[PDB]
């Protein structure tokens, strides 16, 4: 149905509207679709659905100008560990993928393609079945306790990666990268945030290490930024984003609770801005906010008010993309994109939406979301959610 208690608020009026260009696209409005896992990919082999997905983004690419940022995708086997998850380093899979932002294309929007790398959120009876680590900073400290069961008796215990399996991740990034550009992506986001592997580094709970890539705030960064700085030489600055939770507490992340958490964050961006000043400027920066600290759990609830993301824009002088619960709360989105540099990621409500870029213009109702089919192997939940035009004509 449409949402009950929703005051829509018309925003054609204001920057959300407006162009911007974003490393190689000219957008022509600033909502942008975050990138949003639903679990259609194909078992086996990580297959982008041959018979849903094209469909799923062709729909959402609907609105011309749109950037679309992908599901997380698996640069590697060993990246992986979600069945029904996709990945970018098969023929199988990029011949999917092609397809994918060629449909993306002909609609005027863009792709970017979002590296994920799992660590510790990994099922590691999934990587046993295939003969794979299951991965993290370090080998003491394990996401929860149903983790370090399913780990013991896969006899799959969480390894603290090396150096030289550092090295082996970071050109498994830089091929996966090239890779999303020869099948035609517009670039790249590297998923530094939610608690995955990149961010299982960057915070001082889930990394007790004592070399050069811990136990200090440079040396939780460096992984997130040896990715980074390799992948920008690969394909170029302005193909690449990156995206952080800097309040995130979703796959035991510390939050604000960490009282050294702004500055961790800080440092990033500010090392961001020193690369973009010496002529190597990211694309975008994205944060989710501290709104939606969990997104399984209902708006409203899981909320950081002890922290804002303000401190960023003192920091990094490029574009942000913001997300949390902007979708029921056009208000604080009209006083967000008064900054010229601000774009605003809407993620569950896009799922529902096909259309919801128009919604925004226009101020009308908006399609409720079905939360038991976020992740499932259906048609159902995906591709038959209507749009405004649509809706009328079954009378919501
Ligand atoms: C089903 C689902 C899948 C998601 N998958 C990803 C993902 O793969 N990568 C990611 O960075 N964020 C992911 N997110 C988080 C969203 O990008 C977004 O930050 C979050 O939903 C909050 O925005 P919203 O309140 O507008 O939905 C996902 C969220 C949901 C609900």
Redesign the pocket.
Same mark, same amino acid.
């Given at each position: 149905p449409f949402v009950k208690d929703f005051k829509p608020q018309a925003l054609g009026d204001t920057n959300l509207f407006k162009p911007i260009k974003i490393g190689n696209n000219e957008l022509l409005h600033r909502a942008v679709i975050?990138?949003?896992?639903?679990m259609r990919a194909q078992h086996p082999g990580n297959i982008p659905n041959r018979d849903w997905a094209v469909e799923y983004y062709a729909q959402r690419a609907q609105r011309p100008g749109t950037l679309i940022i992908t599901?997380?995708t698996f640069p590697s086997p060993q990246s992986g560990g979600y069945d029904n998850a996709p990945g970018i380093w098969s023929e199988e899979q990029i011949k999917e993928w092609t397809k994918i932002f060629k449909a993306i294309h002909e609609n005027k929007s863009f792709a970017w393609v979002?590296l994920?790398v799992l660590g510790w959120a990994a099922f590691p009876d999934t990587l046993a079945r295939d003969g794979l680590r299951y991965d993290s900073a370090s080998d003491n400290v394990y996401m929860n306790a149903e983790q370090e069961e399913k780990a013991k008796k896969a006899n799959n215990p969480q390894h603290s990666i090396t150096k030289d399996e550092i090295k082996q991740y970071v050109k498994e990034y830089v091929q996966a990268a090239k890779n999303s550009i020869a099948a035609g992506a517009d670039g790249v986001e590297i998923?530094s945030?939610?608690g995955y592997l990149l961010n299982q580094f960057l915070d001082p709970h889930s990394n007790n290490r004592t070399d050069e890539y811990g136990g200090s705030i440079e040396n939780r960064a460096r992984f997130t930024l040896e990715v980074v700085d390799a992948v920008v030489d690969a394909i170029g600055p302005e193909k690449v984003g990156l995206?952080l939770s800097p309040y995130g507490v979703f796959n035991s992340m510390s939050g604000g609770a960490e009282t050294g958490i702004v500055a961790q964050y800080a440092y990033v961006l500010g090392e961001l801005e020193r690369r973009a000043k010496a002529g190597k400027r990211l694309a975008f920066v994205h944060l989710?906010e501290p709104?939606?600290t969990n997104? !399984?759990l209902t708006?409203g609830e899981g909320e950081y008010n002890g922290g804002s993301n303000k401190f960023a824009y003192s920091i990094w002088k490029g574009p942000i993309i913001r997300?949390?619960? !902007?979708?029921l709360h056009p208000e604080v989105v009209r006083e967000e994109v008064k900054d010229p540099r601000t774009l605003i990621? &809407?993620?569950?409500?896009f799922?529902s939406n096909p259309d919801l870029v128009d919604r925004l213009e226009k101020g009308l109702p908006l399609n409720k979301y079905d939360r038991d089919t976020? &992740?499932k192997m259906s048609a159902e939940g995906y591709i038959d959610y209507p749009t405004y035009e649509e809706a009328l004509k079954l009378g919501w």
């Open positions: 975050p990138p949003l896992t639903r599901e997380g979002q994920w998923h945030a939610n995206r989710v709104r939606v997104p !399984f708006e997300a949390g619960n !902007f979708a990621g &809407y993620g569950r409500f799922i976020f &992740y």
